[model samples]
Target chain A: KFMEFPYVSPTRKQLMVDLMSTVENRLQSQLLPCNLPPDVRNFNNPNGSAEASLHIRSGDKSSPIDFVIGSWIHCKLNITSISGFLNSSTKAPNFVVELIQSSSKSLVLILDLPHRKDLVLNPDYLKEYYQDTALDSHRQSLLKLPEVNPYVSPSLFVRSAFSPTASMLKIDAEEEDKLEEILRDHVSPAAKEVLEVWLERCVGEEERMELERRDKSFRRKSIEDDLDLQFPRMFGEEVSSRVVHAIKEAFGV
Target chain B: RKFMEFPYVSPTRKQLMVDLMSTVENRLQSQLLPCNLPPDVRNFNNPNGSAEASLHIRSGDKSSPIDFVIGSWIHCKIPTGVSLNITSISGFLNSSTKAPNFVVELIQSSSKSLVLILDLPHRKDLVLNPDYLKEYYQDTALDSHRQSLLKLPEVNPYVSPSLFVRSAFSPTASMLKIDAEEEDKLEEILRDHVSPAAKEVLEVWLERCVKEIVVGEEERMELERRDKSFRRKSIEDDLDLQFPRMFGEEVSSRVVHAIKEAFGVL
Candidate 1:
């Protein structure tokens, strides 16, 4: 059984739901579901009343993707995120998109495709993914907006893992009902475009693949580290544990 | 210093400021002293007077338990038909050790949006001390408005950019962004929710924190020291560095100087 998603605004909640829906629908044929615990799939801790649900899929003979993990957390501080990884052996990059909204009406959005090669040295590699694609243009449009502020991750690992063209930014919904507009007009469109690009290139899913066979190390290590530092701080240890468990399971770490 | 008038401020907002300002001035009239600043810091009007700002500062004598109370309003006419108005009111207590500072800051950028920061910012650590907690935080029950404001769909949290500023707020701090684009809806919120919430906190600040909490000369010195350190750091990390472009360097520097004097910064 699937879990119920958290709602913010109709627009914000819809954007998150639609994004998760897109991945599930596109890869349903090739993707294999994990036999995760029911509680693990739909995790909720009371008191702070933070609820989270994680859906993870592994690749089959039809696709080269190692795993896809999509999830959301409902609390005063909110997170809506998804990451798709290809087998470490492939040249294709992994996909990462997350929108972390705080009670202060500010948002930190991360949308990127982590590259395997040195972009500065490898022009063709950068061109194939970043420059020639819609990624930079979307990033540019966001940059021109006065409300958007560039956000730098405190962790060096996170800063390094992001692509040269990654959209790492913070934006505030200063006006009433403004967040709904932003989530709808700006963040959602940009996110979908990024999601679409990654899916198009991979053209891809399987029963759970072997951990040794498919896990992407360099990218996974940074993401896991980033997750460890962030989860407890925002959601506390109890809820963070379950969220961490689902990712570790999917990462096969 | 005279009261702040908002040419662009809504009737509700204007009344809220006027009433709150009168309440503070009337209650502590004798103790208050005019904090003198040059024209640049006290008021800033562009060459054509289309864009202007007025800041008023008031403080008590060193012996009095009240430190400083400051308020300001900015009205900047833009190239577009819309005019910009921003208003703020913040007061710090002389109770350096235990009591909280009174803050009712409403930074309204447009009819649709504003950031409201309402709190009796405490100086004592809540890690321990039930009597102190009950007396100040629990007694005031400041979380009431914070909770209510957050329940509104248009209202969300107002996060401070500085880590230091974020960590320094009291547990029951009500810092929210209200984005009701409708003029009537905004006015209704300002009158029904914001004004009452501010008055309640300000009442508690004057009645409980200001009247009762007291310290000896030795303790007062320590309190002032810690208080100055906190304010100076915040201004440096949060405001002083950021205000230069918003107001020109001349105005910004003079304003910062005035604030340091008012806060008893050496």
Candidate 2:
């Protein structure tokens, strides 16, 4: 006898929104003052039907530089991929956060959580650039990500730990609150300022437009100053007078 | 009216500023002038007042902008019992300009020397002193690398050997005063003493040094791209285009032959 469990299934949109909120909360609390820019958070769409993702990148506006002392995060999340809890009691969605170190093109750490009581922590994967064994130790030292909200638990919320090539730290549920502390240890104060400024204007469409406007104004003023200085200066009469006087003195005329 | 660019390197302890200026003017006259005559050095000795002397050089057409003026002003502060030596040189090139492209200054009693060696490069290109060269390149394998480049056939002829030779070599005797023995000795000195380090400096300076006025970053980068072999080859081709005008074909060919013979490959 197959009896249908007649309960209205929570749509992917609702689940994704819930998931994104949890992520945003963790990000705001854990990596506050220095974390992902608002734009990365704003651009995310949990309401979409397709597999949506929230992408976060670290460092300055440009590409992350190698050996630069800062934490760069390239985190991606797949919204619609959770299957286990939605389809059946036995099934669960894959809610893993990936932390990518951009330089080495290596997946140094992974945090996998399945409904079947399998919370995976495989941080041993090394790329060619990982000749320094200290990178692994640094990753091991990072606190685990904080546990997910009680209502969302048992619905697999896995976080993949990633770090700049300078470290091999993994992101986990147990130490989510300590992200700011973790980043503060690695990134310089100057870089932290850059990250904060970038984060503030990253969220809303209006803020982004305002930033572009200011950038254009600055560039325009710079070019105007350059134009003012470009004209050649005249050799002028003072030097001319000196030379003439010198020549006259030479001749005793 | 003349506008000349004078670029000089920092002076050394033993070298007097006045002496260096004199050497440069002397070298310019003896080496640069096609006439092979030395410029008259008019040293006006004013005991009571400041003494002043100037070298007024005239070469090529009278109206041509190839004239040169080099002068020294020695001011004697009688009350203070101090003497200030000032040396200035200028040239008017065919491309007219309102002002000198560059200027150099020197002061006496300071730890500086202004020894202008004739047939030597303009001071800007001499980034390293003779001693510096010996210390840096002497112990390295650059000597062997330079020897290999020298061995290549047709390289000397195509490479504007006269410019390269005069670019670094400083002749001791005035062109007019140089005898057969002096010529041989000068050649030996360049070959034996300078060549070991000169060859290495010459190649590097050719690629890196920017002599002309650079307009912008793009122009500077373009000039710096002389490091590319093709760009260097292109420059030689351009030099070859003006070869007949600068050096008569017969003279150029004879000089090339002489170089080949010197290498024992003729």
Candidate 3:
């Protein structure tokens, strides 16, 4: 009941929670919920049935994933998510994905293994991380479906932050019930597929002698931008501030 | 403003609004303002009804010649059983305005009772941008959309009371009023006809008007002059005078001034 929201009956939201649990289980670790003021588990749903979850773990000392943060906020009407395993040590790109269902029955799903280095400056890094991994195929394949349209953020920085082959999509459901169906059937599989590749392909590159030494500082700003746009108005300023400060303190933001 | 009531978008209306925002962002993201919404211009309260009206404004870079992009939803409630909901979104090209400004508005009292004002208004500034007549209106198949939507049942043309408002719009502008609708049928109309129509109008505006259109110094000045003149004319005669009766003087002034600040025309 910690994740209780009046989201659709066969809720896709529950599946997102399940996916987080699966990742937690796969890493052979239990998630420690962050100390976000009053219980990181449930937002006091007194006014509106809202919930916020901020669970994280520092993985095995030898593993590729240095830190992983999975957080989501559920207001009465809509839910937004931010969850990923970001490895800072090696050239392995950060596994970042977020779903923001803004004023539409259409859901904006942003999935990317955002690179640390400038995509334009580094050719080898770009090819090794993006082209070789075949992530563009997922974006390409999904777009072939009639209901799936490409999504672009209002911020140019966000547009630039994503990998060249990242899956940015607008999934439209013709009927209200169909939105739940699409997320359950389509989005879940795509997310799992991306995760599977990340878990396997992102390892073993650690042995490469020269680590790309660009500042991973952008992640902090990106996180800051993400929370500010969605959180402040979606929830009230008070709760959004608490949530933002906790997340910012984690990274350099 | 936490518990202040606002106009609620049903699943269907929300979907359509999402599509419009997405389409707008896709083309105009580089140009239109987002990311940093000025706090002063956001979430203004309508104290009489304990409701907060939402307003979003976006300005553009030189690359795209947009002056202002204004979108808002206001719900006015009177204690004696009368309440009104209004949603308006419009994108005006900069002072060197060659092409028409894209607009869509919805005013609803009951779920069934609504008036949809849709247009790409080409005002006195049309003379400033020479090729807009053929390039924006003729070549682009925008009139076909008007023809298609006009045929829908219970939809009738809405005539503006003010002559200036009437003359600002294109000859083929679809200003429709739906008297009423059968159970949830209006949702379908918004999703089907209204969504596609608005999308096409925006597509034309972005593609032809905003995207890489060169403007001379003289042309730009007149655009500013004409845009300013139009705003002054519309605000004084229409919004300022009418909004007070519906939303009370305080809420009216706040809304009007915020709009004036956003729409500088110059």
Q: Which parts of model 2 are misplaced by more than 4 Å?
A: A1-253, B1-69, B88-103, B109-266
Clashes of each: 12, 31, 3
Q: Tens digit of lDDT per residue, candidate 1, span B151-209? A: 88788776664334544567677888988668788778888888999998899888887
* Evaluation by lDDT, superior candidate among 1 and 2: 1
Model 3 per-residue lDDT tens digits across residues A1-253: 3344344344656666666666777766524434445554445444765666566566555665556676566666455454565454456677766777754467888887766653322445656776677777777777777788766554434544566667888888777577777777777787778877776663244433223222233545466566788677665677777667766765544
Model-by-model DockQ, in order: 0.02, 0.01, 0.01
Interface RMSD of each: 19.4, 29.9, 21.7
Lowest summed lDDT across 10 adjacent residues in model 2 chain A is found at A148-157
Q: What is the per-residue lDDT of model 2 for residues A1-108, given as tens digits with 9 covering 90 to 100?
A: 001111112222233344334434433433223232333222212323211122231222222110011111112212122110111111111123223332221112
Per-residue CA lDDT of candidate 2, range B164-196, in tens?
222122111001111123334433433443333
Mark the regions of model 1 whose C-alpha exceeds 4 Å error after superposition.
A1-253, B38-40, B47-50, B77-84, B95-97, B128-131, B213-222
lDDT of 1 by residue, A132-178 (tens): 77566776678667678667664434554567667888887687377
Candidate number with greatest TM-score: 1
Better of 1 and 3 by lDDT: 1
Q: Of 1 and 2, which scores higher on TM-score?
A: 1
DockQ of 1: 0.02
Which candidate ranks first by DockQ, i.e. highest? 1
TM-score of each: 0.51, 0.20, 0.47
Q: After superposition, how far is residue A39 of candidate 3 from its true place, in Å?
A: 97
